[PDB]
A paper describes a structure:
Here we report crystal structures of the full cytoplasmic region of CpxA, a prototypical HK involved in Escherichia coli response to envelope stress. The sensor kinase CpxA senses a variety of envelope stresses, including misfolded proteins, and transduces this signal to the RR CpxR through conserved phosphotransfer reactions. The full cytoplasmic region of E. coli CpxA (CpxAHDC), encompassing the HAMP signaling domain (residues 188–237) and the DHp and CA domains of the catalytic core (residues 238–457), has been produced as recombinant protein for structural studies. The CpxAHDC structure consists of a homodimer, in which the HAMP and DHp domains from both subunits assemble into an elongated central coiled-coil region flanked on either side by the two CA domains.
The 3D structures of wild-type CpxAHDC (or the point mutant CpxAHDC_M228V) in complex with nucleotides have been determined in five distinct crystalline environments using either single-wavelength anomalous diffraction (SAD) or molecular replacement methods. The polypeptide chains of the HAMP domain were fully traced into SAD-phased experimental electron density maps of the CpxAHDC orthorhombic and trigonal crystal forms. The domains are formed by two parallel helices (α1 and N-terminal part of α2) linked by a long connector, which despite a low sequence identity adopt a dimeric four-helix bundle similar to the Af1503 and VicK HAMP structures. Despite the overall asymmetry of the CpxA homodimer, the HAMP four-helix bundle is perfectly symmetric as was also observed in the Af1503, Aer2, and VicK structures. A strict 2-fold axis passing along the length of the coiled-coil relates the two HAMP subunits, which adopts a packing mode closer to a canonical knobs-into-holes model than the unusual complementary x-da observed in the wild-type Af1503 structures. However, a negative slope in the Crick angle deviation plot suggests a departure from an ideal knobs-into-holes packing mode due to a weak heptad repeat periodicity at α1. Overall, the observed CpxA–HAMP conformation resembles that observed in several Af1503 HAMP mutants associated with a kinase-active state. The 3D structure of CpxAHDC is highly asymmetric, not only by a different orientation of the CA domains, but also as a consequence of two potential bending points in the central helix α2. When considering together all CpxAHDC crystal structures, it transpires that the DHp helical bending promotes a strikingly different dynamic behavior of the two CA domains in the homodimer, primarily due to distinct interactions with the central four-helix bundle. In all homodimers, the fixed CA domain is sequestered by the DHp domain in an inactive kinase conformation, with the ATP-γP positioned far away from the phosphorylatable His248.
Author numbering:
A (entry chain D): 188 to 455
B (entry chain C): 188 to 404, 418 to 456
The structure:
């Protein structure tokens, strides 16, 4: 009973759930000093991590504002002057920086703050829109999207825009790297929802698969492509799902490409 | 006792000691899975904190490159076209972002140098060198440095280069903005070390004192604040009795 409590609390903290376990302050006899020192440890760790994460959020917010004024200026150029070759350079770079700042803001919105404004939502209600937009996007690319099993009215608790973006990034990423087909499969049990996204694109090496959720990920074969953001997408996915008490895995797809697995616990 | 082992291990990690794997895997069969999962937690936390630091150390590098291509585009427009009003606007914002990125680059060079394994260090051993270099720098500026009370062999846990640079930045800043004198005073109790840096320079308004640790206003005191806060301490900016700015750093003591 007390060893089980401390093991589950250490395994929880190890996944990114830096929250107080009052359960360790009810421990019979002597595991109260160990449990109370453990919760003191959690508080100290949370205070230590939020400092660097805050610096990140502050830089993100300070960078955001002049870039918007810059984006306004370029829009006013396109007004006085026409379609120039230089504008095609400036607006391109402006958008690249824009996406980067926005993604930095998001990664400072997720893991950093406990200030998460959460609500109770149902899986189908949450991701149906994302799946429909992904289906349209697939149709436009001349690619096929098959939802092996759709999400049902399964209870979840957390930030809806965060989870919406978490699945949106996974499926859009699968849309990008795929050759012709993409597959999305939902699955539920007593404990939680498991979303599996497969693509028939080029496989990812077992070394790269382990470090794909890295903030700025040096991808071999996709650096040569240069057809995306900066690699913040998947790190956003990971931080967003981990703060939602879930997990993310990257495996080799039976379609031949990359398999992405998301797991989220059910609300009770 | 196994509860005492786990309590001392949790109290160690709480002080920033991830850089140690205690032997919680040698005793009763039940406390072995808890001990092994605890050490796995320590490794995961260490892996989580070095990744957060890597992110800040990479932002500068990632943002720099497209901004330079943007600055190239605008430069080519001043070449093919004249000096438009909109180009003046875009270039103003481009220079604002430019300076910010350059300062972030400076922050990732200082993080790349000071980036190490947090370890157990003694206050005097840590900052004596910084205080001596600051004394020489004061002498060269025709200014005076008085260490009211020196640091003693007081136990601390953390990155030595980080704390070295934190005090170095505070004292160098106080040397810059002072008129003639700077005072550094150390103080210890059972809980922690309190460093106070004063200068006879121009005072800082109570509004500005609250937003002095803001990132952009060549790293800034924001690094000082975040580095001391990650070292479980705190930083305060008050009005100095010398007439200038008083900077207070507090750091907790390490206990085995
Ligand atoms: N001792 C001081 N006396 C007066 N002004 C100070 C002092 N310390 C800091 N400041 C003010 O605080 C501002 C922010 O500090 P800082 O981040 O170190 O800026 P900087 O990049 O110029 O070194 C400085 O621009 C300066 O005007």
């Amino acid at each position: 009973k007390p060893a089980r409590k401390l093991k589950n609390a250490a395994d929880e903290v190890a996944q990114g759930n830096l929250r107080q376990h009052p359960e360790l302050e009810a421990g019979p006899q002597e595991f109260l000093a160990a449990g109370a020192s453990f919760n003191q440890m959690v508080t100290a760790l949370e205070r230590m991590m939020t400092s660097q994460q805050r610096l990140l959020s502050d830089i993100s917010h300070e960078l955001r504002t002049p870039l918007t004024r810059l984006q306004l200026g370029t829009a006013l150029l396109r007004r006085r002057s026409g379609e120039s070759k230089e504008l095609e350079r400036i607006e391109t770079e402006a958008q690249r920086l824009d996406s980067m700042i926005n993604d930095l803001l998001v990664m400072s919105r997720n893991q950093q703050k406990n200030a998460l404004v959460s609500e109770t939502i149902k899986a189908n209600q949450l991701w149906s829109e994302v799946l429909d937009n992904a289906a349209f996007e697939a149709e436009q690319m001349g690619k096929s999207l098959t939802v092996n099993f759709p999400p049902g009215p399964w209870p979840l608790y957390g930030n809806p825009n965060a989870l919406e973006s978490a699945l949106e990034n996974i499926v859009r990423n699968a849309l990008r790297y795929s050759h012709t087909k993409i597959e999305v499969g939902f699955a539920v049990d007593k404990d939680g929802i498991t979303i599996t996204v497969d693509d028939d694109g080029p496989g990812v090496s077992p070394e790269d698969r382990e470090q794909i959720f890295r903030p700025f990920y040096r991808t071999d074969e996709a650096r040569d492509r240069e057809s995306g953001g900066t690699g913040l997408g998947l790190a956003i996915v990971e931080t967003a799902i981990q703060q939602h008490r879930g997990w993310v895995k990257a495996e080799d797809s039976p379609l031949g490409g990359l398999r992405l697995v998301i797991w989220l616990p059910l609300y009770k």
